[PDB]
Design a protein around this motif. Structure first.
Motif, PDB file in Angstrom:
ATOM      1  N   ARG A  41     -29.393 -15.360  21.709  1.00 41.44           N
ATOM      2  CA  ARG A  41     -28.884 -14.613  22.855  1.00 41.44           C
ATOM      3  C   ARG A  41     -29.216 -13.142  22.683  1.00 41.44           C
ATOM      4  NH1 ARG A  41     -25.157 -11.129  24.727  1.00 41.44           N
ATOM      5  NH2 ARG A  41     -24.858 -11.304  26.984  1.00 41.44           N
ATOM      6  N   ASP A  94     -19.631 -13.684  27.378  1.00 40.67           N
ATOM      7  CA  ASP A  94     -18.830 -14.156  28.486  1.00 40.67           C
ATOM      8  C   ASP A  94     -19.705 -14.981  29.420  1.00 40.67           C
ATOM      9  OD1 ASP A  94     -20.340 -12.005  29.315  1.00 40.67           O
ATOM     10  OD2 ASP A  94     -18.713 -10.984  30.347  1.00 40.67           O
ATOM     11  N   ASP A 134     -20.357 -14.531  32.659  1.00 39.47           N
ATOM     12  CA  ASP A 134     -20.688 -13.812  33.875  1.00 39.47           C
ATOM     13  C   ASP A 134     -22.115 -14.057  34.354  1.00 39.47           C
ATOM     14  OD1 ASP A 134     -21.849 -12.511  31.736  1.00 39.47           O
ATOM     15  OD2 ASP A 134     -21.114 -10.523  32.241  1.00 39.47           O
ATOM     16  N   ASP A 151     -24.659 -15.000  31.723  1.00 39.27           N
ATOM     17  CA  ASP A 151     -25.493 -14.760  30.559  1.00 39.27           C
ATOM     18  C   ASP A 151     -26.442 -15.924  30.332  1.00 39.27           C
ATOM     19  OD1 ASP A 151     -24.250 -12.357  30.122  1.00 39.27           O
ATOM     20  OD2 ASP A 151     -22.885 -13.122  28.597  1.00 39.27           O
TER      21      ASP A 151
HETATM   22 MG   LIG Z   1     -22.273 -11.437  29.988  1.00 39.56          MG
END
Ligand SMILES: [Mg+2]
Ligand SMILES: [Zn+2]
Ligand SMILES: [Zn+2]
Lengths: 1270, 109
Positions: free
Chosen positions: A502, A537, A539, A541
């Motif tokens: 990530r 989170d 949102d 990602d």
């Molecule tokens: Mg995020």
DNA sequence: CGAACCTGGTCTTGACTCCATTGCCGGATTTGTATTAGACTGGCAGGGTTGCCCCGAAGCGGGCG
DNA sequence: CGCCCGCTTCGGGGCAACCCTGCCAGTCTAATACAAATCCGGCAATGGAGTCAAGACCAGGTTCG
């Protein structure tokens, strides 16, 4: 060495190249500015793409086509001239350009400090006048011919100036005769008295300007005579006329030219040895500016002396050409070609060279030829570095071009863009979603993506199951997605891990290895307990799936990088599989206890029995499904499968209550029984309220004492129970649940009156503008505190907003204060406080101006968050290169040195109050000495891990200071040993003998940045940390003492004056220029006059520079100072970092020592060398006649430490690539490839982890017993 | 629009990269003027040229002393050519006499 | 038990066709080079504002053989 | 008298995160004159390479005396 580059490497030796190297590299001589015939699209002969020079464009075909198979290979067609071979030699074969005039290289001329300038002792301001054909330079002079024809030519000079004076008294006599004619025609007639003498003034003014003429040309002749007397090599004759007159009257006695061939002539006529020894003599005797310049020239002079490098290669005679595929002219579909922007620079060089060659062949005057050579020089300068000197050579659209230096510099060079970070195959990305039914080691994977990741695997497998005749029908069967490919896909997926990147990968847990499983949909399902490590989170990602291939790669993913094997931090060892957020709330409501709830235990009797006992938790669950028992009521169960706490175990059983049979009663809640059924059998009963710190302590204990698989299964069970009871907790947000404090209006009125009185006292002139702002700021802070206090005491406990906070799930109390109550003070765009302030909650709704004030602080905070990140990632980037070579090599250094730890300092009444920062400063460390007290026994012996129970034993026995090892004083040669590094914070066990602990240290330091605000002139955040690691002189510099004694305090003109009174004594150290803007240091009281200071007592208040505390108080105290000063910042943000990471970095800072005395061996003064090389050199040179080189420790910043490394490859790949590359090329500094970025670059196996030969050369045979049984 | 994809101007073949036998071949030695030696592998049945542009880049002849007399071409056009094709010898000789008596009358008077 | 067969190819022979492959040979086109005689004689011309850091260069006040 | 050096300032290079996401930038004296080179188009020597027709030639699986 290997020319086709098989993987056998020991060195990588750069060197300055010569012309006999360049025209030996080449396979031809490019001599036409042509690339491709416009009509047939085939390369030209003797051009920039010629197949004779550079190799064929077609596999095993010549240019005329007379040979077209492999059977003709290695041979050359006798007509076209093209060597028939494979068509990837155009990747590698080079060519060269024979220049018609010599040309200086640009890196050894232009880049500061100039190297031709230091080699020849010339100024760059005047060397640019030489090599760009602006001024002449004298390259040789005859000595004895000047020594005697000096007399003969000064005789000739006297003859010449006497002939000049023959002309001059001819002037005198002629205007004397014309002036007596002025007499005989002005005083012989009738005229005016002044007009008869205007001709007198005329001829006299004529003689004045005429003697000015003769005087100026005699001054010219005097100047040219003085120049011929003082003529010497390495001189510059500016003023063209003087040089031409000087040559054609004194054409013998000297040679002097202009430009790069004259620089080449100077490099020909240059003894480096006597020049070098003259510089050695100047540093032997000189001082001041001369000695500093003598050192700065002795650097490059001894660099050219020590190696076998002739310095003749700094000028250049044959320029080489990069192969055609590295500058390719590819066509797009449709004839719009694509050149590679080097072709135009080579065409400029080829054009200007051919024009120079035809001008010299034709016979041209000197202006045209020197203009052409200056154009040739600028062409080569643009080729090697466009944009360096003067205007960058533009293209169309005014775009500067990309030269060879711009292929390496900056972020878009080969180093940072294509050597270190590559696009990889067997890859994919998608958006992520939460996966709360997954196991910890599992993960989601969309089948439409897995079918393209695993396409060769599934291709092989459904060839093997006879579903396809061959590979091609299998590939078409995949591309049409016939539905048995999914059934094959399950089998090829099972037990084959994938990686989950990530970006941005801040620290080590950004890449983990999960077992994949197939999921309906197109979004990667991530398990929720790795959100804290990934900082992810949901949102929107996105995470990148990689795919390990080899057996070594699958084993590394399965054993090292698996999820369930990486629970704790690398930094502080707290868990990151800890159940956070929602889950935590759920558990909180599950273990909280409600007095007065349904179905309690009351012992009330007489009329009825207690009605509180329950024979089993099974019966308790049945009475909870019926509406009798609440989950959170206090009852008395009788447990048979759970281990009681230590006091009840020692009570009921004493020594050996083994739990699966025994029975014991307890007054708890049902929720705590259901909670303790998640934890394992050996773990005792907990019976508390699951605050988040309590869950952290439980998982830390359970990870420190049990195996890892038990920890993973326990964490999974906590996740399931936490979600299931988070749904039932009823945490909602409604505006009826955001209660306002009822006493708010009275509080606002009571502070409004004080605000009104401060404003009135400002209006009546009793105080200035700033002090009323300060008074209002303090009053409204008091108001904010009172409103928050009344809000805190107003709420119940089952209010969900205060429940989320006081559980510890998320959110501090200030956010509840800004939901209901008072926003408080809102900052300026500059940083001050607005004195109004905002008096409405976000429940009541703000007014227009209050909202407009809040926007300032919001946008300021968000932009500051963006810029810090960039800065935090950049700090991490620097630190990784600093500590890339701290890897654990030996099991044990076996020293006895080591630091001391503060470890629960003494109380004034006298106890052992625990030092609060022990977990960062004392744990996970190995003692070098022993713990003894009051001449008693040993307590903790040498070399123990020193965890929690032995710290408890030491504080029980009553000692305060333990001498413990550290990575500061590990006496191994290259990187630390293991026992000085102590416990690895990730495993919980001792660190392995392959770890790259410098990288873990650098990541854990510059990982938790971002979130590191600032404050309301000391720097107090991430720039403070950065100036500490850069070893800068700080902004608020507070000077420290130098010796003890009382102080000579004085308040001078508008600032201070402080001096130390010595005690032996000696010279008084005077500190004059200390600003009155600072403050004096307070301790225990403020610094008063006559007070007795320490040796290194800090005098003023602010920040001490680490250089000065190094010079005063040595290496130990600056290590203590740096560690304390960085950890002060990180504790101020409340971030747990263990000190050994900072110690790894500081140990890299304090490596080198300086040379103040050369001794008599090899060490230039002021140069910085490594300590081990220094000691080994002194051990060599105490024999063969004894002299010490004198060394002093230096504390250098991390940029200079990284750039002054041993391997030129890493220092080139880091920063300042041009200067690192050019002085490495001068020094002929051979790399040894022993580091850590270099093996990443050249693709071989890195010497850390599973790359070192203790693990890379394991012989694995079947054992003989099972071999015989097989 | 389309696409992007591009090709180097040349084909990439793939056959057996065999090494056991090839077409047999000679080795000839060419020499420049400045003592440089170069070896060039020609095939057997191949008319070997007398001169050859070498790896150095200047024109190199073969080490066999045959010297096939290449009959090097004329100088292209000189300033003497561009002068002579527009004037005549008696006019240029007249001007030569004029400058001759000019430096004469300058020098001895 | 032998006669005669007809058929598995096995191989050759001769006759015929087709087709590349130089070889001239001439016209088309393609690329290089040269030559134009009134006089004409020193460029446009644009951008450029972040901030910080380290270091080296030029200079100015300070004393001095 | 002119001679030189310690701090100051001016300038100058290096660096400032990381995933995706994009896809192709300009302008004027003008022609003749000739020759080498190149190329391409069309018959004309082929003889090699393929193709068919025919048969001789076996020596073995199929059937009659
Ligand atoms: Mg995020
Ligand atoms: Zn060819
Ligand atoms: Zn050690």
């Amino acid at each position: 060495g290997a020319m086709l580059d098989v993987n056998f490497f020991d060195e990588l030796r750069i060197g300055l190249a010569t012309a006999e190297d360049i025209r030996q590299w080449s396979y031809g001589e490019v001599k036409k500015p042509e690339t491709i015939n416009y009509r047939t699209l085939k390369p030209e002969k003797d051009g920039l793409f010629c197949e004779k020079i550079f190799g064929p464009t077609r596999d095993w075909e010549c240019y005329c086509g007379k040979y077209k198979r492999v059977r003709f290979k290695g041979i050359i067609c006798e007509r076209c001239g093209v060597e028939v071979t494979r068509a990837k030699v155009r990747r590698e074969r080079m060519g060269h350009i024979e220049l018609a005039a010599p040309v200086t290289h640009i890196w050894y001329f232009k880049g500061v400090p100039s190297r031709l300038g230091y080699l020849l002792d010339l100024a760059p301001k005047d060397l640019e006048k030489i090599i760009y054909f602006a001024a002449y330079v004298i390259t040789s002079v005859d000595e004895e011919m000047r020594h005697n024809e000096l007399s003969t030519l000064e005789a000739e000079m006297a003859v010449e100036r006497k002939a000049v004076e023959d002309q001059r008294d001819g002037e005198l006599e002629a205007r004397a005769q014309k002036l007596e004619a002025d007499l005989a025609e002005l005083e012989a007639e009738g005229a005016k008295a002044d007009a008869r003498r205007k001709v007198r003034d005329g001829g006299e003014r004529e003689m004045r300007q005429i003697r000015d003429r003769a005087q100026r040309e005699l001054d010219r002749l005097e100047d040219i005579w003085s120049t011929f007397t003082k003529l010497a090599p390495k001189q510059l004759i500016v003023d063209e006329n003087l040089y031409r007159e000087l040559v054609d009257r004194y054409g013998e006695y000297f040679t002097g030219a202009m430009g790069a061939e004259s620089i080449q002539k100077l490099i020909e006529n240059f003894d480096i040895d006597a020049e070098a020894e003259s510089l050695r003599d100047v540093i032997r005797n000189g001082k001041g500016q001369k000695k500093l310049r003598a050192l700065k020239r002795l650097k490059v002079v001894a660099a050219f002396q020590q190696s076998g490098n002739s310095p003749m290669g700094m000028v250049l005679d044959a320029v080489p050409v990069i192969p055609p595929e590295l500058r390719p002219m590819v066509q797009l579909d449709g004839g719009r070609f694509a050149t590679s922007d080097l072709n135009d620079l080579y065409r400029r060089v080829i054009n200007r060279n051919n024009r120079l060659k035809r001008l010299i062949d034709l016979g041209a005057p000197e202006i045209i030829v020197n203009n052409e050579k200056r154009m040739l020089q600028e062409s080569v300068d643009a080729l090697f570095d466009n944009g360096r000197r003067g205007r960058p050579v533009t293209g169309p659209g005014n775009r500067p071009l990309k030269s060879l230096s711009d292929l390496l510099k900056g972020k878009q060079g080969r180093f940072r863009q294509n050597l270190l970070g590559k696009r990889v195959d067997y890859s994919g990305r998608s958006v992520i979603v939460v996966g709360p039914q997954l196991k910890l080691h599992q993960c989601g994977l969309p089948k439409l993506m897995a079918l393209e990741l695993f396409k060769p695997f599934v291709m092989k497998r459904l060839v093997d199951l006879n579903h396809a005749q061959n590979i091609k029908s299998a590939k078409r069967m995949v591309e049409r997605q016939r539905p048995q490919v999914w059934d094959v896909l399950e089998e090829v997926i099972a037990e084959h891990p994938v990686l989950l990147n990530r970006a941005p990968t801040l620290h080590r847990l950004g890449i983990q290895a999960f077992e994949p499983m197939l999921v309906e949909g197109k979004a990667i399902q991530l398990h929720p307990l790795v959100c804290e490590a990934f900082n992810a989170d949901f949102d929107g990602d996105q995470m990148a799936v990689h795919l390990p291939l080899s057996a070594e790669a699958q084993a590394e993913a399965r054993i090292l990088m698996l999820s369930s094997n990486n629970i704790l931090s690398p930094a502080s060892g707290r868990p990151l599989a800890m159940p956070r957020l929602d889950m935590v709330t759920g558990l909180y409501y599950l273990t909280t206890e409600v007095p007065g709830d349904t179905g309690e235990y009351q012992p009330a009797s007489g009329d009825h029995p207690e009605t509180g006992v329950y024979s089993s938790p099974a019966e308790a669950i049945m009475a909870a499904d019926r509406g009798v028992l609440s989950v959170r009521a206090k009852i008395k169960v009788r447990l048979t499968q759970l281990r009681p706490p230590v006091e009840i175990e020692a009570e009921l059983f004493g020594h050996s209550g083994w739990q699966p049979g025994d029975a014991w009663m307890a007054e708890t809640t049902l929720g705590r029984v259901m909670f303790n059924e998640l934890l394992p059998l050996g773990y005792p009963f907990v019976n508390k309220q699951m605050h988040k710190k309590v869950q952290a302590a439980i998982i830390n204990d359970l990870a420190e004492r049990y195996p890892m698989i038990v920890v993973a299964q326990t964490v999974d069970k906590l996740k399931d129970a936490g979600f299931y009871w988070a749904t039932r907790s009823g945490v909602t947000v409604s505006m009826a649940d955001v209660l306002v404090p009822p006493r708010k209006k009275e509080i606002l009125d009571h502070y409004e009156e004080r605000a009104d009185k401060v404003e009135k006292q400002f209006q009546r002139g009793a105080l200035n503008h700033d002090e009323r702002n300060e008074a209002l700021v303090e009053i409204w802070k008091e108001a904010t505190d009172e409103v928050g206090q009344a809000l805190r005491e107003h709420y119940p406990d089952d209010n969900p907003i205060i429940t989320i906070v006081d559980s510890g799930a998320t959110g501090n109390f200030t956010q509840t204060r800004t939901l209901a109550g008072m926003k408080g003070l809102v900052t300026n765009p500059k940083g001050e406080f607005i004195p109004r302030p905002v008096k409405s909650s976000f429940r009541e709704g703000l007014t227009v101006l209050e909202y407009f004030i809040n926007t300032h602080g919001a946008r300021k905070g968000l932009a500051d968050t963006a810029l810090r990140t960039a800065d935090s990632g950049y700090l991490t980037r620097r630190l990784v290169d600093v500590s890339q070579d701290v890897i654990v090599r030996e099991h044990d250094c076996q020293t006895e040195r080591g630091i001391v730890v503060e470890l629960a300092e003494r109380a004034p009444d006298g106890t052992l109050i625990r030092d609060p920062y022990i977990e960062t400063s004392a744990y996970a460390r190995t003692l070098g000495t022993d713990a003894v007290d009051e001449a008693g026994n040993v307590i903790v012996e040498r070399g123990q891990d020193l965890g929690d129970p032995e710290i408890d034993a030491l504080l029980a026995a009553g000692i305060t200071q333990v001498k413990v090892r550290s990575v500061l004083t590990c006496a191994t040669s290259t990187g630390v040993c293991a026992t000085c590094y102590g416990r690895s914070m990730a495993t919980g066990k001792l660190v392995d003998i392959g770890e790259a602990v410098g990288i873990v240290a650098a990541q854990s330091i510059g990982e938790p940045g971002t979130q590191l605000t600032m404050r309301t002139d000391i720097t107090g955040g991430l720039p403070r940390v950065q100036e500490l690691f850069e070893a800068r002189v700080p902004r608020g510099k507070a000077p420290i003492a130098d010796v003890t004694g009382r102080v000579r305090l004085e308040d001078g003109e508008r600032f201070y004056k402080i001096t130390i009174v010595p005690d032996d004594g000696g010279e008084e150290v005077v500190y004059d220029k200390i600003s009155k803007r600072q403050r004096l240091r307070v301790f225990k009281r403020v610094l008063s006059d006559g007070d007795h200071v320490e040796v290194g007592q800090q005098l003023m208040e602010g920040s001490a520079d680490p250089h000065e505390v190094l010079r005063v108080q040595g290496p130990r105290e600056v290590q203590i100072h740096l560690v304390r000063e960085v950890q002060e910042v990180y504790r101020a943000q409340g971030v747990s970092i263990h000190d050994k990471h900072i110690e790894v970095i500081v140990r890299q800072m304090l490596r080198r020592v300086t040379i103040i005395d050369s001794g008599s061996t090899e060490f230039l003064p002021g140069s910085l060398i490594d300590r081990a090389e220094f000691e080994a050199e002194n051990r060599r040179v105490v024999a063969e006649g004894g002299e010490p080189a004198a060394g002093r420790p230096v504390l250098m910043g991390i940029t200079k430490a990284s750039l002054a490394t041993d391997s030129w490859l890493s220092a080139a790949s880091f920063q300042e690539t041009t200067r690192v590359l050019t002085d490495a090329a001068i020094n002929c500094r051979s790399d040894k490839l022993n580091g850590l970025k270099e093996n990443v670059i050249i693709g071989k196996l890195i010497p850390a982890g599973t790359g070192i030969n203790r693990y890379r050369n394991i012989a694995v045979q079947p054992t003989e017993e099972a071999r015989a049984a097989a | 629009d389309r696409v992007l994809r591009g090709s180097r101007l040349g084909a990439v073949s793939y056959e057996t990269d065999r090494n056991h036998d090839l077409a047999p071949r000679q080795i000839a030695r060419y020499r420049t003027d400045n003592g440089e030696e170069f070896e060039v592998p020609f095939a057997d049945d191949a008319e070997i040229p007398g001169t050859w542009l070498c790896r150095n880049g200047m024109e190199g002849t073969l080490i066999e002393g045959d010297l096939p007399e290449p009959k090097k071409v004329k100088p292209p056009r000189t300033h003497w050519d561009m002068l002579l094709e527009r004037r005549s010898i008696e006019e240029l000789e007249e001007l030569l006499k004029e400058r001759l008596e000019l430096i004469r009358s300058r020098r001895r008077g």
